[PDB]
């Protein structure tokens, strides 16, 4: 319809359910998540700390949640291979339980008869696609795909754009992230990441981030070409890259921000932003672009070395995202 | 008195600070299947509340070493297996909310500990709250229970109160810090929805039996208080807001009075006694169970007032299990 | 109904926001000394606590501009010089919090406006709290406050308690986010020393007369309420725990079923009622008054209980404004 | 002795007062601050959100705070050129207002009365000094210095390091730094600093700097090799630099390391600190030293293009400068 299916209704799952919910040409058949009720997941989808109410009729009965009179079913697997993506006639199902990111263990959904799978994460063997940078190397006998991440969807369009223009030789980023679900609230475990499991509305974080790599994996022209690391900081959700660019022909930054600005305000249209106001994070809550070029805040030291700024919000322009790429998978 | 930690989060770690700087306590073994020792001593050493270890932390193969002294760590889900006979523990300090009750916290001296002390409220294990009930230890007790933070805050202040004018009934809120149970952005909770939401950007009602178990550790309050809490952004430090209809009409003079000399006299330690202009912040590593807030209490009629008595949810209460410990080892 | 706004921080904005999207409402004017044109249009377009502006916002030499109404903007330190009399301005909506009295006030008038309404409480002007004594309000009266949102929040539902069971007495606590008097990191505030203390790091203690002056607007309850806050670090949102000893037995269901009939039916868009898992950010944006929290209150005995509402301290009391605004107009 | 006065009680007042009460061979004479009274300043000085409460007895009379016996008289002058230095004796006024930067406007305090004026924020006419990287370049004929800003400590010592042992080509640096006092509780009038006006605690908030630009005064070598930015986040305190830069020769991360380590166990002692643990914020409050690298957050993209990463303590690592530039320049 295309009929979508999300397991995991976490962070992303609910909102690509709240958009996806508001696609016309998206019908959303089912959600999975073992870790919670079906009058829970009601509740959880109603009310939203960050994005705030839901603005709809939420219910349930039974066996579905209920939204503006759309019934969804729920199950609650924790083996996804057990799914009824098959006589529910799903098409495709959208992984977001950060748990299922390999292609033979998204292969379970498509066991269970879903038709392709797209996952909400980066992979290490799923191709991967970013929206206005290579979805349309996307071809149709691929039926498991990746989104990236959050991180990569706002710096690979940027990159591209500075790429094309003028060329970049090289570079190292940085992004002062949001806190995110799998940080602590006070000090507590967190063994395959230490600094993660420190208090997280108390503290400046570092974290390593495989994000500026993989935007080699989606423009092969940088690959090798960069690299960086983040710090998670006590805002609840929106983040911002900080990209430090060496670049092979020499400009001025305003020659940078129209080039910017014209590809926000053309093939990058809705994806690349671009601001020249006194913007804070807060600016950017429930903002649907991968990437907001931040005009004003950025800095150009020498004609090819510059530090260019992009805002995202991580949680819900990346699920737009989501909505798209299963958007494109269908026509396509 | 020899003693082992069972569980390594907040109450552990910090029991395990405190119990290191008493002279007459012996940290002899750590348990914790989560954590390996390096990231024990990580895990000890820095502390984002309550700053660094000032002492030599590290580690080796079989233990963690602080200042010189080996501690032994374990890591079994199943505290009954624990060499707590071979390594001759007096008590069992139980940090892990786990094995709150009598038939669970017995795996403790099945294992070979003498006794047992739990660091949580406990249905079937006797409570005791140092400067309330305390007395009441007797030494055939192998399996005892600290309470809560809460009611070590509330209970000497409700004991003063009642013991002077009379508590007819009182009805509590506290401000709490927000807690390890807490999510950093809204995520399931499936026993506590609002308790789910994202912490540090919410005020999140809560119920809480603090106010309840007040009544066990002094029975003549039995029925006579309850009350409910608010979780909030900080990050440690609470505040018991309590409401009471009191006996005897009194002033707000003759209440401060009467605390006061408790504070400087029999509860001294327990309860604290200030009138100046404080904030939670203020109580950050504060040892008192109890520090009563003048200046902000208010009393609106003569049998019927609001009192104010901050508290370091962890620190206080952490000092209060290893003052516990020693007291049920000098009975 | 022409009118003007006085100073343009957090509630002068927001009654902005709302005043534009109702229909018998024309805003005319804005003043504030502080800001120039193309500042204020940014500070009111963008919002940290309650979004974007969902309109076109500009601004020219001697206006801001908000989807094609051109708001005139004037720089008057002494409201006496401003030009409503030739703006005919039919109120002055002041809320700059510093002529809040009769005397003050009347600088307004004095340069024209018909009528003044105070976005804060008042010891001399009239005091009125919608759904509480609006129809109070008679048409000879030029000055007039709209309370405090604390007192917008306590007054509707203290009036519907009272009315049902008879409020004895009561002690309120307002747990109350953090507002622009506040400091980022500790610094001087001389006439409140605990507010001077890190805005975001602190549970602090604070004196509020929002329950006292709820015997303003209900004379039967003078003298019957008073209570405190505690501000803690959440942005906007704060929510009133009030304590009540009541004159007629009741249970906490009659009490409930008492509440929603109220916010059902008389005090419909004033007071509101939930029984859901609610937590502060859930009434962001909410133009209630007052949200009674059925779930989170608690009933110890038949005459003491208590009762918990929330409210979104800065839209709440904003949309009161408005409403307040457009029923001395229609009067 | 030396004898110093402090202008101005506001965060460095309060702290380089902790800090000097604890030196021996300094006396602390006098503090003014007009925005406050005496029984108002034994407040502000015993309690602490942020470092905790004083560790010693804090008092008041009429006319002084006094603190474990020493009295130090507290005035209230808005023109510091009416305050008694001179017959009070005081060798340097230490100014932490930001208010009276410059030299003719420092100038005041000598005027007073006192000998020497050390001013706690950079200046643009002021010699500047910085602990470890120029103190040496000062000579005793000069009467009016800065000991710069916080960032400007933290960047210096480490952008010296790394110059001498690798030479900088160019530099561009990120500090994300804890939220400060001129910063605004909820949205409120900032007209020199829109985004500075942004509620603090809800948001990250891009902010100028010209702190690394100001290491091109503390060393000349590097005029004009150095600019960045600041991203100010909602913690209460310590503060992050991260500098990416492009090196004349060579290197591995594994030699980046050693040669700061050797520097921060050496020559730097005591202002450049070192570390590999899986440190955050709140593990450096209180820290005294300038510059703590964080040898495992940094990352090498390429032989001449790093990204590296240190803490400061913003407020106690600058304080403890203070009087250690007080120090120096009594000796001197
Ligand atoms: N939140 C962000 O800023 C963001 C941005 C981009 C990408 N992502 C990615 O999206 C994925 C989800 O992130 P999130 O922030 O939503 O986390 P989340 O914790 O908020 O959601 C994860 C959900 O999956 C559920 N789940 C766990 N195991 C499951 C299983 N066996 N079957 C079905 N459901 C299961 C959990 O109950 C939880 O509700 C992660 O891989 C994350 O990296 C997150
Ligand atoms: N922190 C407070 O404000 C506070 C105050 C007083 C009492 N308490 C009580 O103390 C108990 C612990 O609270 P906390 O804040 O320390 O929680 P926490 O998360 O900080 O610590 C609990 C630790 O126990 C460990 N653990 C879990 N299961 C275990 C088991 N099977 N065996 C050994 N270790 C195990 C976990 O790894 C975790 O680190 C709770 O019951 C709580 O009610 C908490
Ligand atoms: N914000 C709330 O939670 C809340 C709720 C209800 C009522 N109130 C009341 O409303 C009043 C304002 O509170 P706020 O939170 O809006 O403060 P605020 O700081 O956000 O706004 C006050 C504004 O008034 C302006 N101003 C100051 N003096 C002026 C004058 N001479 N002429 C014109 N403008 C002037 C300032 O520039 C400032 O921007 C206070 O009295 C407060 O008690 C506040
Ligand atoms: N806080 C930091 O992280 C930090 C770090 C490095 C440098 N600095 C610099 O130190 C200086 C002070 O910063 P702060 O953070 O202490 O600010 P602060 O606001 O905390 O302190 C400033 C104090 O000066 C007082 N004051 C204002 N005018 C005065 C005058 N006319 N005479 C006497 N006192 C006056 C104020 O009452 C206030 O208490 C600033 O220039 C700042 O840039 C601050
Ligand atoms: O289950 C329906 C939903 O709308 C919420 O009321 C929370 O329980
Ligand atoms: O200084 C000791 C510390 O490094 C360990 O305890 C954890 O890494
Ligand atoms: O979009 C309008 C906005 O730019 C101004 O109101 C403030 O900069
Ligand atoms: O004025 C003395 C000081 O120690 C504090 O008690 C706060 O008033
Ligand atoms: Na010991
Ligand atoms: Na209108």
Request: charged letters at 25%; one cysteine or more.
């Amino acid at each position: 319809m295309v009929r979508v299916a999300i397991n995991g209704f976490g962070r992303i799952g609910r909102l690509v359910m709240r958009i996806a919910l508001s696609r016309p040409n998206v019908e959303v058949v089912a959600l999975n998540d073992p870790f919670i009720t079906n009058d829970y997941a009601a509740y959880m989808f109603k009310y939203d700390s960050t994005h705030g109410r839901y603005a709809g009729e939420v219910s349930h009965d039974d066996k579905h949640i209920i939204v503006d009179g759309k019934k969804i079913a729920t199950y609650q697997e924790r083996d996804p291979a057990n799914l009824p993506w098959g006589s529910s006639n799903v098409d495709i199902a959208i992984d977001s339980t950060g748990v299922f990111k390999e292609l033979d263990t998204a292969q379970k959904h498509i066991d269970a008869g879903a038709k392709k799978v797209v996952i909400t994460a980066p992979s290490s063997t799923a191709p991967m696609f970013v929206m206005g940078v290579n979805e349309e190397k996307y071809t149709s006998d691929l039926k498991i795909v990746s989104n990236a991440s959050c991180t990569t969807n706002c710096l690979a369009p940027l990159a591209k754009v500075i790429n094309d223009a003028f060329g970049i030789e090289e570079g190292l980023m940085t992004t002062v992230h949001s806190l995110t679900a799998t940080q602590k609230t006070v000090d507590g475990p967190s063994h395959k990441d230490w600094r993660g499991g420190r208090t997280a509305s108390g503290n400046i974080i570092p974290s390593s981030t495989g994000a500026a790599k993989a935007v080699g994996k989606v423009l092969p022209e940088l690959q090798g070409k960069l690299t960086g690391m983040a710090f998670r900081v006590p805002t609840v959700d929106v983040s911002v890259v900080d990209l430090t660019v060496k670049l092979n022909k020499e400009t001025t930054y305003d020659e940078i921000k129209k080039v910017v600005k014209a590809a926000a305000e053309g093939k990058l249209k809705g994806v690349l932003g671009y601001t020249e106001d006194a913007v804070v994070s807060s600016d950017f809550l429930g903002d649907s672009h991968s990437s907001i070029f931040d005009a004003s805040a950025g800095i150009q030291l020498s004609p090819k070395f510059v530090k260019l700024v992009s805002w995202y919000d991580n949680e819900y322009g990346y699920s737009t995202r989501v909505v798209d790429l299963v958007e494109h998978v269908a026509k396509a």
